[PDB]
A and B are shown apart, each in its own frame.
Chain A
Amino acid sequence: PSIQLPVDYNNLFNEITDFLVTFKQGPKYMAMLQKVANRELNSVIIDLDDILQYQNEKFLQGTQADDLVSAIQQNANHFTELFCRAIDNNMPFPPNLTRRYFLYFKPLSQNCARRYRKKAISSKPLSVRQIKGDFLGQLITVRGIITRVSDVKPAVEVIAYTCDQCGYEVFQSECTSEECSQNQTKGQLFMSTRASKFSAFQECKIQELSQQVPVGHIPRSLNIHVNGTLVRSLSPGDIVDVTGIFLPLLTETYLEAQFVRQHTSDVEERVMELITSGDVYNRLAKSIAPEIYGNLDVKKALLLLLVGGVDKRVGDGMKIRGDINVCLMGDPGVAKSQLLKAICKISPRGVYTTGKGSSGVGLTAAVLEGGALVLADNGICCIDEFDKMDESDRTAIHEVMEQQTNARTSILAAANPLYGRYNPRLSPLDNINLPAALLSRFDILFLMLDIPSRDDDEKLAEHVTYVHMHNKQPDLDFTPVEPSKMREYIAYAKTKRPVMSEAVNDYVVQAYIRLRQDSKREMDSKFSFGQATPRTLLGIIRLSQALAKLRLADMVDIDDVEEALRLVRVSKESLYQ
C-alpha cells in the first residue's frame, strides 16, 4: 500500500551533486575524484562535517537547503548508492556489477554540531547496550573495545559465468543471455572465478568497557563488519570509536564499519610546589598510607619499588631487569594486607591477588586468556599469603621473577608464618614455606614481628584508634601528597635515567667488598637472612638507580648508595628483636 513521507530524494540528489561540484577544498571532493580519475586512489571518504558546513553555508546565504546529513543519518543504506551514482556520472553490463572502488562516510564531530547549534546524536559515543532497534539502518558512532577479529575471507558480491554457446559474460547453470534464450541450444555455465567480484571482508566484534556496564550485568557485544580498503583497521584489544551503519519476524543485528579511530607545564607547577616543600624522598614515603603504622623504612622500599629501577639491555640479547622485588613477612592480624591494597591502588598497572591462583587460571594462561602476572605487564603485582600457593602457582612465579615474561612485573609479596605464629629462634626459611631459591631473587626482604611490647603497642593503638575516630592520621602536622600527584611524580621520575659516575663506581665496589667480607660472619652465625652475593651488588645498583631517579637526578651520587646500603642493613634488624 502506498504512503507519503516528507523525504524528497530529488532535492537531496541535486544537493549532493551541487555539494560535490561547489564545496571547496578548487572543490575538495572533485580534487579527490580527480585523484581517483588519475588512478591514484581506490576509496572515497565522505565527510559529513563538510556536508553540514555546506548546509550552514547555504543556510547563512539564505538559499534552499534540506537536512541532507539527517537523511543520510536515517537511511544511510540507500544514500551510499546515491553518492556512488553521483560519482559514477561526475568522476573525471550494469555499472554496479563492475565497480571496484569503495565509499564510506565519516561521522559528524560534536564540536561541529555545537558550533552549528545542533545535536549530533548519531555520533555520540554511545555503547552497544544503548543501541535500540530504532537505530537499524542508521549511521551511528559506537565507543567500545574490540575483543575478536577474524582473518581475511573471500566475499563474492557478483558471481561471473562464461558460456560456450555465446561467449557472453553472465553475472549473478544455464546461460541467461539473449542469444541462448533465443536459441534452442544453451551452453552450460561454469564458474569464472578470475572474473567474479571479490570483496575483502573481515569479522570484528566490539564490547562495552567495564565503566559502561550497569550494576552487576555482563558487558554486551555487537558485530562489526569491515569491507573494502577499511580492512585491517581493527585489531583485538583496541579501544576504538567506530562509526558504521547499524543493520539487521525476529532480526539479528550487525554493523558495517565506515570510520575507525583509536583512543608538561600543567604538572610541572605541582612538581615545583613539591620541590618548594622539600623533603621529597621522605614526604612521599610518609604519604604512603598514613593510616598504617610507622614502618617508614619499609614504606621507603615501596617508594623505590613503585619508582622501579632502570632496565639495561646489555647486548647480544642479554638482559638485566629494571624491576624491584620486595617481600612482606609478618604475623597475621597486623592488617599488613592494607599496604598491599594501598600500593596496588596507587600504581596505575597494579594487580592484586590472594593465596593460590584463582581457579588455577590465575597464573599462566588458559584457552589465550592471560593470568594476573600477564595482566600486570609493565606494572606491579601484589600477593597476599604467598606461601600457600601451589607448586604450579609458584613455578610460574619463578619464571616471571627471572625472565619477566610478557609479565614485566614488580612483585610485592605478603605471607603469614608457616606455623601461624613466628619463632625468631628459627631461621626465616624454617618459619616459611618458601625456599632460598625464590627468596634470593628478592631485593628487600623485610620481616614483621608482632612483638608484644607496651611501649610500641601504645603508640600503634593510639595511631589506629585516631584513624577510626578522625578521617586523617593523628600526625596532622604532616600534609600527605595526594595519590594522583604521587602517581604523577613517579611517572615523571620514570622518564629520567640516572647514570653511574666513576666516583660512585669505586664506592659501590668498596662498599660491596666491605659488606661481603663481613657478611661471612653473619651467615656463619646462622642469624641472618642471607649471605652477601652479587644480589647485594646488583641490588644496590638497582636501588641506587631508583633513588637517583627518585631525586630526578641525571647521575647517581654517593648518598643514594649509602641510603641504599642503609635500608638493606635496616632490614636485618627485624631478626634481632
Chain B
Amino acid sequence: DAVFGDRVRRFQEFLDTFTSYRDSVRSIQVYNSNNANILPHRIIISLDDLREFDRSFWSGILVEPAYFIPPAEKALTDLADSMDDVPHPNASAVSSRHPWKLSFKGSFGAHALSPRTLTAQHLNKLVSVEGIVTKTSLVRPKLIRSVHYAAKTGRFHYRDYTDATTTLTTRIPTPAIYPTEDTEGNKLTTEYGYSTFIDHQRITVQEMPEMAPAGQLPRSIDVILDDDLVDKTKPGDRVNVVGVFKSLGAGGMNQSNSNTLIGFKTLILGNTVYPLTDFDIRNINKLSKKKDIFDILSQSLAPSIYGHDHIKKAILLMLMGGVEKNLENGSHLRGDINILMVGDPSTAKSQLLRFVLNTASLAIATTGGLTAAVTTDRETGERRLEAGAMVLADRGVVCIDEFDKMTDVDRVAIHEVMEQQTVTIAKAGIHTTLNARCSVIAAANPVFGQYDVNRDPHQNIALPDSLLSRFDLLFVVTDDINEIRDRSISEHVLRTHVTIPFLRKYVQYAKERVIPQLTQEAINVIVKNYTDLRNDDNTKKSPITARTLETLIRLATAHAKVRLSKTVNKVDAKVAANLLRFALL
C-alpha cells in the first residue's frame, strides 16, 4: 500500500540524515569489490538515534515490527542496490540480489526481558531477552527466490516465496514447490546457479539460574536465526538476543478443537546477537617491590578464615602458576599447580573454597559430565558433545567439593588431566584430544568424620596414591580447640547472631606479562634440597619423588610472578623449599 512506501522513504531519510550509517555501508561495498570472503549485508541501528529522528517510527519497531521493519528492510536494500552500479559481469545477477538486514542497539526501554518475564503481553513486539543457549538445531538452507528458464519461450522466469517466520506481516502463504511450468504452461528449465537460498537455524534460550527462584520449573523460549546468524553460537553460551516475539499456528481455533489445554505456540524472530588501567598496573608493579606484599596479599585472601597463612599463600601461588616449556623433540612441560585439602567436613574447607570460587575469574565448581566425553541430542535426533568442567577450566581453576565422593570413572579421566593437561577422548565413532590446562583445588573428608591426625589420608580417606601424588600441595585442618583462640573467631560469628577488586587486577597482570625463567641461583638450592629430602628417611606426608622437584620449580616460578620478575632468584627457591617442608610435615 501507499503507507508501506511512505515508511520506506522515511527510513531512507534516516539513512541520509545520519550519514554515519550509509558510509559504513559504502565501506562494506568497497571491501566487497576488492575481494572479487564477503562481509554481511547487515548494519546495527541505534534506537536512540531513531528515537530522536522519528519517535513513531522508533516506537514502530518496538511496538509494531510487522508494519515498520519490512519498510525499513526494503529502504536499506534499496539504498545498497542503488549506491553502486555493480559492474561485475556475472556476480551482479546473483550476489547483488541479497537483501540487507537490520540490527538494533541502544536503549531498549521496557523491552529488556528474560524468558521468565516474557509473557503474552509482549507478543508482536521487538524485545531484547537475556538467557543461556541450551541447545542449537541443525542448519538447513531455505528457499527464498526461485529462478527458472522457459526454454520454449526463450526467456527466463522467477518466483518468490513467503513464510510465516520470515514475513513479520501475515502475508498469504506460498506452500508451492519450485515451479515446473509457468503461466505459459511450458516446462521450465531449472536454474539452480541463479536461485537464492538462505540458511536457517533454531536455538533455545533459557533464563539464567542466577535469578531463578526455587520451587518452579525454568522458563525457556525459542529464537530463530538466519543467514549470518545461523552458526554464531554454541550451547551453554550466555546471550542477549533482540528479536520479534511472535506467535504461530492456532490454539485449536479451526473446526471444533475446543480443548482447554491447547495454547498458542510462540517464539522470537531474533535478528541481533550479543554473546556474553595503567594507574592500576603501575600500582601493581610498585606494590610488588615491598617485602611484605607476599604476606599482605596472603591476608586479603580468605578474610573469613583466621590463620591458615600457608594455605592462603598456597592459593596465591596456585593462581600465579608456573611456566610451561616446549622442546625440540616435541615435548611440553606442565607449569600449573594443584592443591588438596583434607580433614573434618565442616571445618573451614567449604569456607576457603567459597572465597576462591567467588574470587577467581575462571573458577568452576565441581562435586561428586565433567569428562566432556558424552553427547546430547537435538529435538530431531542429531547429537553434539557437551563440554566438561575440566575442559572448560583451561587456563583457569577447578573448585572441587566432596572430592572423596567422585567416581572411579572421574579418577581415571583426571589422571591425564592433572599430569598431561589433556583429555584423550576415545569413544564409539568419536576420537579427539582436548587441552585441560587447569589448576585444581579440592577438599576431602574422612569417612568417620573425625580425622586421625596420626595417619596419612591414604588410610583416613583411602584414595589411590597415584591420584594423590598428582596434587602439588596438601593441607590437613581440624578444629583442635583452644578455647580462648576459638572464642576470638567465634565472636565474629556471634556478631551475626589490598582490595580484592585491585587484587584480582594484581593477579591478572602478573600472570599476563611475567614469564619467569630459571637462574643459577635456584639450581643449587633445588638439587641440594631434593637430595636432602631423599636423604631424610623419616616419615612424611608423602615420599620424595621427582614430582616434588617439579613442584619446587612450579612454586618458585609462582613466587617470581608475585615479585613480577622474569627471572627466578634464590629467595624464590628458599620460600618454596620451606613451604614444601611444611606441607610434608
Contacts and interface: CB of A to CB of B under 8 A. Distances in A.
Interface string B70-90: 000000000000000000011
Interface residues of A, number: 82
A355 interface: yes
Given A7-B149, A331-B545, A465-B518, A134 B197 contact: yes
Interface string A475-500: 00000101100000000000000000
A156 interface: no
A382 B384 CA distance: 29
Contact of A468 (B415, B458, B518, B527): B518
A362 B431 CA distance: 11
Interface string A315-345: 0000000000000000111110110011001
Nearest to A482: B328
A173 interface: no
A355 B415 contact: yes
A250 B140 contact: yes
B331 A342 contact: yes
Interface in B160-214: 161, 163, 182, 189-195, 197-200
B324 to A, nearest CB: 10
Interface in B509-531: 517-519, 523, 526-527, 530-531
Interface in B135-155: 140-144, 147, 149-151, 153, 155
B331 A289 contact: yes
B157 interface: yes
Contact of A253 (B141, B156, B523): B141
Contacts of B325: 468, 471
A6 B531 contact: no
A249 interface: yes
A517 B328 CA distance: 47
B465 A420 contact: yes
A372 interface: yes
A421 B149 contact: no
A332 to B, nearest CB: 5
A400 B234 CA distance: 42
A1 B146 CA distance: 11
Given A465-B527, A469-B523, A251 B142 contact: yes
B526 A334 contact: no
B200 A218 contact: no
A239 to B, nearest CB: 15
Contacts of B161: 249
Interface string A213-226: 10010100000000
A358 interface: yes
Contacts of A536: none
A4 B156 contact: yes
Interface residues of B, number: 85
Interface in A354-387: 354-356, 358-359, 361-362, 366, 369, 371-372, 384-385
B217 interface: no
Contact of B192 (A5, A136, A385): A136
Interface stretch (B2-10, B266-274, B416-424): B416-424
B143 A461 contact: no
Interface in A98-150: 132-134, 136-138
Contact of B534 (A210, A345, A362, A454): A454
A279 interface: no
Nearest to B154: A10
A524 interface: no
A452 B327 contact: no
Nearest to A366: B428
Contacts of B297: none
A77 interface: yes
A468 B426 contact: no
Contacts of A469: 517-519, 523
A210 B192 CA distance: 32
Contacts of A464: 546, 549
Q: Which of A1, A5, A137, A210 has the most CB of B within 10 A?
A: A5
Contact of A462 (B144, B527, B550): B527
A291 interface: yes
B142 A5 contact: no
A458 interface: yes
A290 interface: yes
B141 A342 contact: no
Contacts of A275: none
B194 A290 contact: no
A545 interface: no
Contacts of B544: 452
Interface string A246-275: 001111110000000000000000000000
B575 interface: no
B20 interface: no
Contacts of A468: 325, 333, 518, 553
A290 B527 contact: no
A133 B197 contact: yes
A8 B568 CA distance: 75
A132 B142 CA distance: 11
Contacts of B429: 369
B66 interface: no
B353 to A, nearest CB: 27
B157 A1 contact: yes
Interface in A274-292: 289-291
Nearest to A137: B192
A263 B428 CA distance: 25
B255 interface: no
B330 A345 contact: yes
Given A136-B192, A251-B197, A332-B465, A461 B530 contact: yes
A333 B547 contact: yes
A134 B141 CA distance: 9
Contacts of B425: 358
Interface string A1-38: 11111110100000000000000000000000000000
B531 A9 contact: no
Most buried by B among A6, A248, A335, A465: A465
Contact of B156 (A5, A338, A460, A482): A5
A461 B535 CA distance: 14
A420 B463 CA distance: 12
B328 A335 contact: no
A471 B327 contact: yes
Interface string B531-554: 100110100000111111110010
B553 A465 contact: yes
Contacts of B155: 2-4
Contact of B195 (A136, A385, A462): A136
A385 B385 contact: no
B531 A251 contact: no
A105 to B, nearest CB: 15
Given A249-B142, A331-B545, A74 B197 contact: no
22 contacts: A2-B153, A2-B156, A5-B149, A75-B193, A137-B190, A138-B192, A248-B141, A249-B143, A250-B141, A332-B466, A332-B545, A333-B547, A335-B550, A354-B415, A366-B428, A385-B466, A452-B534, A461-B530, A465-B518, A465-B527, A471-B325, A483-B329
Given A3-B147, A137-B192, A341-B331, 9 more contacts: A3-B155, A5-B147, A78-B191, A337-B419, A341-B420, A369-B429, A452-B535, A464-B549, A465-B523
Interface of A: 1-7, 9, 70-71, 73-75, 77-78, 132-134, 136-138, 210, 213, 216, 218, 248-253, 289-291, 331-335, 337-338, 341-342, 345, 352-356, 358-359, 361-362, 366, 369, 371-372, 384-385, 416, 420-421, 450, 452-454, 457-458, 460-462, 464-469, 471-472, 480, 482-483
Interface of B: 89-90, 93, 140-144, 147, 149-151, 153, 155-159, 161, 163, 182, 189-195, 197-200, 234, 325-331, 333, 373, 384-385, 387, 409, 412, 415-416, 419-420, 424-432, 434, 458, 465-466, 469, 517-519, 523, 526-527, 530-531, 534-535, 537, 543-550, 553
The 5 closest A-B pairs by CB, nearest first: A137-B192, A333-B545, A74-B193, A133-B141, A133-B197
